[PDB]
């Protein structure tokens, strides 16, 4: 039920643009990646160890 | 004699011809009653993990 963190996605998985009925990626590739949390791209999302 | 009665960044005229941020409560349209966002943070969980 909670939450384990929140990522407002930096640069790297950002969208430059998304027209309407479009998708990011694009309808051709396959989904990209948020690898981590903070603003600078750095350190990967953590979890508990009973997590 | 006031620019602003009510105080808040909003003029007489803009809270009474209802001219401004139309999501604002129609009450707030009254040079008296201040435009005015009253926000509290509710709880819902914590999670404790242990380092
Ligand atoms: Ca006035």
Redesign the interface.
């Known amino acids: 039920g909670d939450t384990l963190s929140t990522i407002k996605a930096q640069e790297n998985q950002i969208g430059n643009n998304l027209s309407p009925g479009d998708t990011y990626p694009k309808k051709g590739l396959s989904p990209l990646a948020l690898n981590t949390m903070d603003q600078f791209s750095s350190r990967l999302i953590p979890i508990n160890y009973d997590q | 004699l006031e620019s602003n009665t009510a105080g808040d960044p909003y003029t007489d005229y803009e809270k009474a011809s209802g001219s401004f941020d139309k999501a604002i409560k129609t009450e707030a349209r009254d040079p008296l009653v201040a435009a005015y966002p009253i926000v509290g943070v509710g709880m819902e969980?914590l999670?404790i993990?242990?380092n």
């Open positions: 969980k999670i993990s242990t």
